[PDB]
Amino acid sequence: GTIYEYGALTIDGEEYIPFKQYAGKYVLFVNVASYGGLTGQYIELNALQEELAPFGLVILGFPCNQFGKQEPGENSEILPTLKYVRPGGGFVPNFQLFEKGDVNGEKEQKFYTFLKNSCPPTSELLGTSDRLFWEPMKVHDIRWNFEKFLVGPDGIPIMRWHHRTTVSNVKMDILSYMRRQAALGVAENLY
Amino acid sequence: GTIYEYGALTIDGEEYIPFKQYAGKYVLFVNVASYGGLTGQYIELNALQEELAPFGLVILGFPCNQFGKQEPGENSEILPTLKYVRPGGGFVPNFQLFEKGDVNGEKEQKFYTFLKNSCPPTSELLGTSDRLFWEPMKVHDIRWNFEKFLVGPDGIPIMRWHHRTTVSNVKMDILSYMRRQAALGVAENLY
Ligand SMILES: [Cl-]
Ligand SMILES: [Cl-]
Ligand code: NA
Ligand code: NA
Fold it and tell me: Cα–Cα distances in Å, from A131 out to A122, B54, B124, B137, B180?
């Protein structure tokens, strides 16, 4: 029951990465889009990655066109869009992006089947179905672009955030969890 | 937090019934349709009503056109359809039917807002959205025609069944619950 059963192809199509490569690391899975209202979170995700990389955080981005069709581009067009359009201004992610694919429905990526079903969903509301480009609909489906899952260094899911939760709050929660683990380790030895 | 905050108009349009009239009774809420694959459950519901009426069971039926559009008729056409078409054969329900209305979405009947949110939903699967004629979609939505809720004699919800659970199994569960309550009453007095 770990993420190490799975892997994904990098966005340039050149390398399949088994998630076992992230053994010993905290992994933050984020489904992404280039034309979302939350696409500015890319800037904050870069900052989070740079700040917490020393403590074992790895961010992985999964482009998905299932939420308002907000990732229309081919895989080769995604990095250019981020750099020159939105966020634009020369932006380049400092974390790994993978090929575009489904996160919900019959053709969803299997590691997302695992992740989605490991934690309760992020809201009671699925939303209006016209905006949700998949079938069938299920209680634990990802609700929108930029939903987030934290997986621990043992490959086991820890927690899941609503897409609109700020990246600062996500950071604060990761740090708190890492501190609790450190403290709980020290305390177990004294005991 | 009881069903006694609500009521509904009978299918003939002649009487509004406050659910407080069912104080002291077990109430089984069933959303119904005339052209459903489960419409034959009407025959079993009649039998359940006749068998458990002496022990305080009341069945209430709420026609709804939101599931495959399987209740197209006007209110005055529903009883004739049941009697002459499906189930047909002269069938007449022996329990009260109310006016057609919504059970999910923005215009859902308020007592169903209460009921749906009182118990977990009946399956992980909502289904394919083309068959579900409401918006927005929510985790606790009724899944199909013939979902069922039991409310106790104090007006508080007890349990909820999947639509495909057989009426014999529903009966067995009601009876078991009523027996447990009787036994738990006797046992509390001895104690
Ligand atoms: Cl977005
Ligand atoms: Cl049905
Ligand atoms: Na849809
Ligand atoms: Na629909």
Answer: 17, 50, 20, 11, 47
Structure solved using which method? X-ray
Beta bridge partners of A150: A28, A159
CA-CA distance, A131 to A137, in Å (whole number)? 12
User: What domains are defined for chain A?
Assistant: 1-191 (3.40.30.10)
d(CA B101, CA B172): 29
Chain B residues with CB-CB distance to A under 8 A? 121, 124-130, 132, 135-140
Q: Do B126 and A136 touch (CB under 8 A)?
A: yes
Label residue B83 exposed, middle or buried (CB < 10 Å: 0-12, 13-18, 19+): middle
**CA–CA dist B64, B29 (Å, integer):** 13
- Spatial CB neighbours of A113, under 8 Å, sequence gap ≥ 6: none
Distance CA A132, CA A69 (A): 8
Please count the other Cβ atoms lying within 10 Å of the Cβ belonging to residue B26. Answer: 20
Ligand lying nearest the CA atom of residue A129: 3
Nearest to B55 by CA among B27, B96, B93: B27
| Token pair belonging to A169 | 């709050």
Cα–Cα dist A33/A13, whole Å: 18
Chain A hits for B108, CB-CB cut-off 8 Å, are: none
Neighbours of A128 (CB within 10 A): 14
What's the resolution in A?
A: 1.9
Structure tokens at A182: 């450190």
